[PDB]
Structure formats: C-alpha cells, structure tokens
Amino acid sequence: SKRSFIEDLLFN
Amino acid sequence: EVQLVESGGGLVLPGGSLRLSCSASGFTFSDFSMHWVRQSPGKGLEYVSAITSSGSSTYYPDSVKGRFTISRDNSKNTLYLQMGSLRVEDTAVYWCVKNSDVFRFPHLYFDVWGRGTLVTVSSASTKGPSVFPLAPSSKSTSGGTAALGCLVKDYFPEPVTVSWNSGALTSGVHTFPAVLQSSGLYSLSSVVTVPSSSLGTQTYICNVNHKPSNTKVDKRVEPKSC
Amino acid sequence: DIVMTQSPATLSVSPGDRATLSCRASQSVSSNLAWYQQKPGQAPRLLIYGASTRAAGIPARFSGSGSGTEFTLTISSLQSEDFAVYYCQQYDNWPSITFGQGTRLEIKRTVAAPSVFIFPPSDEQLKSGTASVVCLLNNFYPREAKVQWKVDNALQSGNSQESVTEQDSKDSTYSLSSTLTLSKADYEKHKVYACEVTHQGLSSPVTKSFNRGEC
C-alpha cells in the first residue's frame, strides 16, 4: 500500500 | 468508538518468555503503525518496539533488540509483543499505542492508547489475595453518611483491580495504593461512602480480580451490629 | 539520542489560574512535539501535537507553543480535573521517539478536615488467625495528616502501614488508609482499639475507637 512504502522509508 | 484492548502479562521468571496481545476496534487497523511503549520508575515512558501498518518493517531500541519481537496479524486486528530473555529491569507497565496516519507526516503522534499491562519479572511465586469486608457500623458513620469497604490482603504481584457492584457503583470510591508488607506481599483497601439511610435496602459488593494468579472474588459487605 | 527535559518537576496552582509547563529538547526537533496528560493508573491522553495543534475534543484552555528546542504547555482556567502528570514527546526521528520525564500538576484548594472512620477486623480474618484494624481519613487537604494507633490507650509503633490516594480529580482532596495488623492472640489480649488523627483542618485531634467485645 501507499502507506507501507512511506513507513518503510521512515523505518529505514 | 476506537479501542485497544490489551491481554497477557502478569508474573514471569527472570530469563523467561512472555507474549502480550492487543486487539483493535473502531478504526482500520491495517492503516496505522503501532508502538509498544513501557513505563517504569526512573526510566519513565519509553518505547520498546514499533511496526509499520503492514508489518513490513520493525524498529527496536538497542536495549531490547534481540529479546523483544513486535508483530501484527491484520486479519485478527491484533498487535503482539514477544518478550524473551526477560530481565529484572524489564518490569514495567506495557502500553499498546496507535500512531496517527503517516499521511500526516511529519506529525506521527500517539492518539490512542490501550489500558496497559503490568509485567513483573521476579523469581517469586504468585499468591492470590484474601478479601475481607470493611463493614459499616456506628464507627464508620458521620453526618448521615456511612463508609464501608474491602481489605484486599496478601497478594503478589501487583495489580489487583477492584470494582463495586460490577461497575454500577463508582461515585465516592477510593481504591488506595497498595502497601508492601514485610512479607513481600501487597495489601490494599477500597472504600466507598454511601447514605446511612439505605444500608438496609442497598447491596454493596466489591469485585476483586488478581489476574496474575487468576483469582476473582466478589465479597458482599454487610453492616455490623455495633 | 534526543533528550527531552521538562520543568518544573512539580507545581501547585489554584483553580482558575494559569499553569505554565516547560519542555526543552537537547537538539532542535522543529515542531515535531506532542503533549500528553496522564492521570494515575490511566493511559496518557494526547493534548497537543505539532507543538501547538490542539487534538480533537481537547478543551480550549490547553495551549501549546514553541518550536526548535523550547516548548511550553499553558493550562488556563485550571480545574480540579487537570490534576495529572504532563509529558512532552518528540517524534522528530519517528518511529524512534523519546518522552520528557513529566511534570506533576497539583491543584491547590482550601483546607478541608478529614472525616475519620474505623473498621474492626472481620470474622473471616479472625478465623484465619489475624486481626487488621483499618482507620480511614476521608477527603482532607493539605496532604499532611498524622495517624496514631492506640491500644488500651498505649501508643503503637511498628505494626501499621498507611498509604494516601492520588489527589481527587473532583474536589482536589486526599484520603488516607492505615491498617494496624496484629496476630489474633495479641488482638485478644487488649480491649480498646483507637486511631487518633491530627490535621491542620481539625482544631483538636479526632479519635475513633471501639471495644473488641462490642463489634
């Protein structure tokens, strides 16, 4: 999902 | 409304393992990242794990890495925290916490919290409470009002929950901080002030629950003839 | 890591007045800061996010301000219900976050004398071999109160424990519970059990007593 991608950017 | 309902916890041996659970309702669980946040003396509030909306990534502070594992099942709308190699320092209240939508970036804040689970790391054994009435009498009345209560004695570890009349009675209740007895067991009292006039028509029952020992006691508190 | 430092550790403010709570970040967090209100035994409740945006459903008298390293929470027209510990939190490095250590906000009120009650031990407990006598001090202010246990008018020491409640969210009072615990055999060796209570709100001490044979 769109949210998962942005959250991955923040988690990594 | 939105809710986070926490289950699990209680007493665990040093070096032992424990899984906490948190079920979500009232919102789209799979849209939001979640944190576990713990609270204990000295360290105060501090997060111990974080996971993305899909579970795609996790984030841990150095203190718990390799020991704590966060995970989620968005099919059952449930967040988990697997706690291993538990330490004396890991005793804390553990909060399930929901983040705001990541589309609000940079403002990713905690808008919904569960009710917390107290995890007690200790090699001692669990012990359920004895519950004794604090009966109303001429020695606990004043000005038309009467005090009564329950003494919840000799349990370990914390916490006990106390309600009155299955939650129908909340006004005028004082449930006190527990004291630590020289035995290492806890004792607590819970009291309520009610009309003196209705002691003969109303029924007062303290509901006591000690989840670490799975001890649940309802004690009816009757007036004493003095 | 980013260290959040709150001040003061505690403050005591009268109802209707304005409380000022401070939070300092060890390095700039822009406006990536939230405030939470936590009453004892409850979850923290979000008040403000983005340093200064009030969360939905939060009373207007809560106001946040600041940017960079110096942040302020202002509570106007203070109510007894505003008793709590207030935390700031930076989320500038989210999902890595840190909290301040909290500021405990205590509500001033007028002096209130305790109502004093005493509870003889239950028959359930006596059959088990123990006697706990409980003295209850209800709804007083300030917090400072002294309880003395007297058994046959002899002052007791070393066989009692007490605890005080958190401040009451409705009337800003305190209550105190004190338990005197004796073995059954020692309980049955005396007649008069009393607690004597001293408090600023009482002109003279208040004594509640019973005789072991009467209750």
Author numbering:
A (entry chain A): 813 to 824
B (entry chain H): 1 to 226
C (entry chain L): 1 to 215
Lines quoted from the article behind this entry:
This class of mAbs recognize the fusion peptide and acquire affinity and breadth through somatic mutations. Structural and functional analyses show that the fusion peptide-specific mAbs bind with different modalities to a cryptic epitope, which is hidden in prefusion stabilized S, and becomes exposed upon binding of angiotensin-converting enzyme 2 (ACE2) or ACE2-mimicking mAbs.
All five Fabs bind to overlapping epitopes in the fusion peptide through interactions involving the heavy and light chains. (A and B) (Top) Surface representation of the crystal structures of the C77G12 (A) and VN01H1 (B) Fabs in complex with SARS-CoV-2 fusion peptide epitope. (D and E) Superimposition of the C77G12-bound (D) or VN01H1-bound (E) fusion peptide structures to prefusion SARS-CoV-2 S uncovering the cryptic nature of the epitope. The UCAs of C13B8, C13A7 (the two clonally related mAbs) and VN01H1 exhibited broad reactivity with hCoV S proteins but had lower affinity than their mature counterparts. Furthermore, VN01H1, C77G12 and C28F8 also inhibited SARS-CoV-2 S-mediated cell-cell fusion, suggesting that fusion peptide-specific mAbs could prevent S proteolytic activation or fusogenic rearrangements, thereby inhibiting membrane fusion and viral entry. We next assessed the protective efficacy of the VN01H1 and C77G12 mAbs in vivo. In the Syrian hamster model of SARS-CoV-2 P.1 (Gamma) infection, prophylactic administration of either mAb at high doses reduced viral RNA copies and lung titers, and ameliorated lung pathology at statistically significant levels. We observed that VN01H1 and C77G12 neutralized authentic SARS-CoV-2 Omicron BA.1 and BA.2 more potently than Wuhan-Hu-1, likely due to increased accessibility of the fusion peptide in Omicron S. Furthermore, the neutralization potencies of VN01H1 and C77G12 could be further improved by engineering mAbs with smaller formats (such as scFv), suggesting possible limited accessibility of the fusion peptide region.
